[PDB]
Design a protein around this nucleic acid. Structure first.
Lengths: 119, 114, 56, 139, 47
RNA sequence: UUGUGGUAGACGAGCGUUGUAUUGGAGUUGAAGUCAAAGCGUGAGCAUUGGUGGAUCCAAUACAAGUGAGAAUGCCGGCAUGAGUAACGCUUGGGAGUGAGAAUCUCCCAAACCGAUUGACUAAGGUUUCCUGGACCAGGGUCGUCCUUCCAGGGUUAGUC
RNA sequence: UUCUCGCAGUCAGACAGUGGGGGAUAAGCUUCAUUGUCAAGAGGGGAAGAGCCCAGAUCAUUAAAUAAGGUCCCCAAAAUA
RNA sequence: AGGGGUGAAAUUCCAAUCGAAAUCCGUGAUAGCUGGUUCUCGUCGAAAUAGCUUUAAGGCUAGCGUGAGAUCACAAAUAAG
RNA sequence: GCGAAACAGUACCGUGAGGGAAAGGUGAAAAGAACCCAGAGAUGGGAGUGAAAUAGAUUCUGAAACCAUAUGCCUACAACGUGUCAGAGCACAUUAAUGUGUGAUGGCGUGCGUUUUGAAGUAUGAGCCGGCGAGUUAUGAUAGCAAGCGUUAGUUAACCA
RNA sequence: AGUUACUAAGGGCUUAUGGUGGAUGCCUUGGCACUAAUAGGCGAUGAAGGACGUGUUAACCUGCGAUAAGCUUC
């Protein structure tokens, strides 16, 4: 039909992915949808393996991929990732984050998942 | 003074609905549907109560004729063997039931020999 | 389109005989006793004993 | 050995509870709650608390265990059906029909009571036979 | 297209008020018919 | 024996039921009714027994028929099938909390960003929907612990406009 | 069965054999008089078949024998040359 | 303000509708017009034919359907020299 | 029965004249299940009163369609208005009844009424249940049947009792 | 190789149990329909009919009237 709720558009999807990866960088773990949780884990692993240099170049590049949240904004998440998250898990080839399956949702029985940061 | 008539109406409607209980589908649980099915069943029963007479009569004819075709004749010839000699009132139903009996129809079919 | 004749109540029941879900999996948790689902977390907060969830 | 508890028309889908009844029927309440609480159907979230009464009643009323029972038979009732309006074309205003259900569940301890409905089936006529032979000498 | 029934009870009162309905034989006949009907509404002030 | 196939058509003789005129009787000993089953007539119909009834009823004779239910593209006491199908109506995500239960309700930032205005204003209309406390029961096109939902309590202040 | 009377209904019928016509002696078109049928007549046959054949069924009969029809089977009853 | 008003013309608009809205009674009008009408057995059992209709979806009469009654078989009558 | 047994013209539609609703029952006496129990909430259990809680408030009767399950049997091999006549096997035994529930399987097997020359009807109204719902009466006449007085015979209107 | 299936997801058949339902049956709180009589209306001296308010009553429907769910003489 014509004009209605937009829903999960490509721009909205990428903005939501950025918000979720910023949230998992700030709060550490995120309880979300499994399909979103896996994409968030992928982006978090990419960010961890990208931030091991800790230079302004990665700052500018990741500036296009983080969306500020309640606790951390873009340039504070920059320092957070460049300081503690990325170097803590660089000791291993991959596996910078782990996604585990949870139960359904109350009202809509949506299969959820939890994403945590670990080596 | 009002005559309710509901009691008679309820009794008759319940009777019509219940008499058709026993068939597949919702035919057990209706009045118009149940009555149409009862009409069909009554038509079949009325046609049958006259037709099954000849139906099982011809069943006897066919059952006898099979044995006669195994006896060396046919039913037309067997009544030709009931016309030229030894006309018996032992009936086509009863000569058929004699086959269920041990060596009873054989005596009849050997008696009708010309 | 639309139906001409109604699908029977028994026809409806026979049609709805396969709307139910498929069978599920079962998993024994070694530390906290529960018969959970496969590659899922139990009510005790652990996927296969990895403490990855709270008590609730 | 019943300790039943009538629900009296909670607003919930009956066709979404018949599906889980068709499985839970014939199983013991010891492993019936487990098989009923592992379904994604949220429609039962307003039902599971009611059963908590019965066992508790069995705890205090008679002293029964409340876990040696089995679900003998459901009733998927069609109680008071409510109607609300739907936004439709040309103001046709189709009616959304909330079908209710007065769900009562029988939890019988022994593996019997499946044949006790049959006992009642035969007794409904055996009792009139008794009453008739009582009056058959007085026709 | 403008929606019908834009309510404004000033015109409603000036139209179907009591003093306008109690000024001719037909109006009083209508008022008597409504009174005998035990109508919940006599004029527009109580719909 | 003939028709008893039967419209139309008209001929003859009947059956039930509410109630009434009666002979009447039964009853918490189980009344009507309802639910159930393995009788009698030529048919309307009569039935007989048992539980539900915790109180009125029944049936032959005749009468008032507001009497006998298949359509009158019926009437209302209610809902099936169509079907878990079509929709769920100008965007949601996370951290924590409320709560027995949270994408759902709330603090926060995100998301979107309209910004001749996703901001307020008073008029007509709404007459409390304003706010506080409680609940989410009826409803939120899902849940919703929340609501502009409900309940309880309170509030709107002119001489000048 | 005419009549007094209650008097209908009918006042749109359809066909078949003979005298037929309108038409292509075509039409599930049509029309009368004599034989009848369906309406309002079922059933057997015609594989189903309102009007055709046998035929007029009141019910019961998993009744005897006949009629059209069928008789290699589905399909009742034909064997033999 | 109603078989009216009204109209840059369209049957346009009058409480999203108007060759004239809704609305109160005669009126349950009428229809030679459709559809249906709740229990049963059964005497006999049609017809859609002739004329007429400002008549053809209808009705009238005579028959056909039928009973109460008259004639009580030579009767209305049917048939073979 | 009045629309109104009922917070019955209440509420409500429309601005408006006007229109215009539906539905009752515990028991006996609340003797309202004290008490305990679960339970955000519903509501229900036991015990106890209560003869009886199908009288515990889902409280007079508490039907059917519709919504579910189940003894026994059958059904995942069927061209079929879903059945009639037969009849396997199994479990079953009464309104003392030519038996109860099936129907594996065979022969047969295209709803009711109308329009009507004639409809499973590929013409139709018809999802279903339940109740209501249409041949009466009055007046003049006609006929079928019966009655009184009774062949210058009966008979009332008004009026009086 | 020919065989029916317990199979059975589920359904059908008689019945039982449970639910909207209060139809049917009993009764009414309630109307309906009559009986003949006093008599044949009120009121600008403030009428009928309403709004508003009022409670030993908290309000609901209603009664009444600032004397305000009322009141006085005998």
């Amino acid at each position: 039909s014509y004009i209605n709720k937009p829903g999960k558009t490509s721009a909205w999807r990428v903005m939501t992915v950025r918000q979720q990866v910023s949230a998992v960088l700030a709060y550490g773990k995120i309880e979300t949808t499994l399909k979103k949780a896996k994409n968030t884990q992928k982006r978090l692993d990419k960010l961890i393996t990208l931030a091991k240099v800790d230079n302004f170049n990665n700052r500018r590049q990741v500036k296009k991929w983080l969306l500020n949240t309640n606790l951390f904004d873009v340039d504070q998440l920059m320092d957070h990732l460049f300081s503690k998250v990325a170097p803590k898990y660089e000791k291993t080839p991959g596996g910078y984050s782990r996604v585990l399956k949870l139960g359904p949702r109350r009202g809509d029985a949506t299969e959820m998942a939890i994403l945590q940061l670990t080596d | 003074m009002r005559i309710k008539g509901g009691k008679q109406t309820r009794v008759r409607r319940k009777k019509w609905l219940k008499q058709a209980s026993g068939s597949f589908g919702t035919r057990h649980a209706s009045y118009k549907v149940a009555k149409q099915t009862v009409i069909q069943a009554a038509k079949y029963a009325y046609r049958d109560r006259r037709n099954k007479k000849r139906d099982f009569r011809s069943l006897w004819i066919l059952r006898l004729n099979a044995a006669l075709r195994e006896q060396g004749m046919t039913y037309s010839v067997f009544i030709n063997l009931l016309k030229k000699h030894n006309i018996e009132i032992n009936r086509k139903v009863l000569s058929e039931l004699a086959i269920k009996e041990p060596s009873k129809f054989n005596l009849i079919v050997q008696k009708v020999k010309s | 389109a639309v139906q001409q004749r109604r699908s029977s109540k028994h026809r409806r029941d026979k049609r709805r005989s396969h709307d139910a879900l498929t069978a599920q999996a079962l998993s024994v948790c070694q530390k906290c006793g529960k018969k959970k689902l496969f590659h899922r977390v139990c009510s005790c907060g652990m996927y296969g004993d990895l403490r990855v969830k709270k008590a609730y | 050995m019943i300790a039943f508890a009538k629900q009296f028309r909670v607003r919930i889908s009956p066709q979404k509870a018949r599906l889980v009844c068709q499985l839970i029927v014939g199983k013991k309440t010891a492993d019936a709650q487990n098989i009923l609480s592992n379904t994604p159907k949220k429609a039962a979230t307003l039902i599971a608390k009611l059963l908590n009464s019965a066992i508790a009643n069995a705890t205090n009323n008679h002293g029964m265990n409340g876990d040696a029972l089995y679900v003998f038979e459901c009733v998927a009732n069609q109680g008071p059906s409510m109607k609300r309006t739907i936004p439709r074309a040309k103001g046709s205003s189709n009616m959304i029909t909330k079908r209710s259900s007065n769900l009562v569940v029988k939890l019988s301890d022994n593996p019997n009571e499946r044949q006790e409905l049959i006992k009642q089936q035969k007794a409904l006529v055996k009792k009139r036979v008794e009453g008739q032979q009582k009056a058959k000498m007085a026709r | 297209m403008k929606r019908t029934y834009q309510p404004s009870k000033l015109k409603r009162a000036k139209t179907h008020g009591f003093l306008a309905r109690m000024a001719t034989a037909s109006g009083r006949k209508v008022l008597k018919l409504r009174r005998k009907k035990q109508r919940a509404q006599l004029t527009v002030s109580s719909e």
